[PDB]
Amino acid sequence: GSVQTGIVLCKFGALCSNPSCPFGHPTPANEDAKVIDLMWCDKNLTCDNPECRKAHSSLSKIKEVKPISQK
Ligand SMILES: [Zn+2]
Ligand SMILES: [Zn+2]
Numbered sequence: 001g002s003v004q005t006g007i008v009l010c011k012f013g014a015l016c017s018n019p020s021c022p023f024g025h026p027t028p029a030n031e032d033a034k035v036i037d038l039m040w041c042d043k044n045l046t047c048d049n050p051e052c053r054k055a056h057s058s059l060s061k062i063k064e065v066k067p068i069s070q071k
Pocket of ligand 2: 027041042043044047049052053054
């Protein structure tokens with residue numbers, strides 16, 4: 001990478017199909033808060049705030065723990 005930031009935000013976000021994905025997705029309590037903040041949040045996959053807009057692991061962990069097309 002060109003900068004040592006250590007943070008990446010994903011192409012699909014709340015629509016990402018694999019539950020173990022290491023990149024950045026929105027709060028699981030709301031799919032319509034896009035990611036604007038380039039920071040790893042504190043509750044991650046249990047962040048209950050519907051107005052958060054930070055970086056989390058994949059929503060497929062609470063949504064659909066079974067991948068397809070990525071499998
Ligand atoms: Zn992803
Ligand atoms: Zn959060």
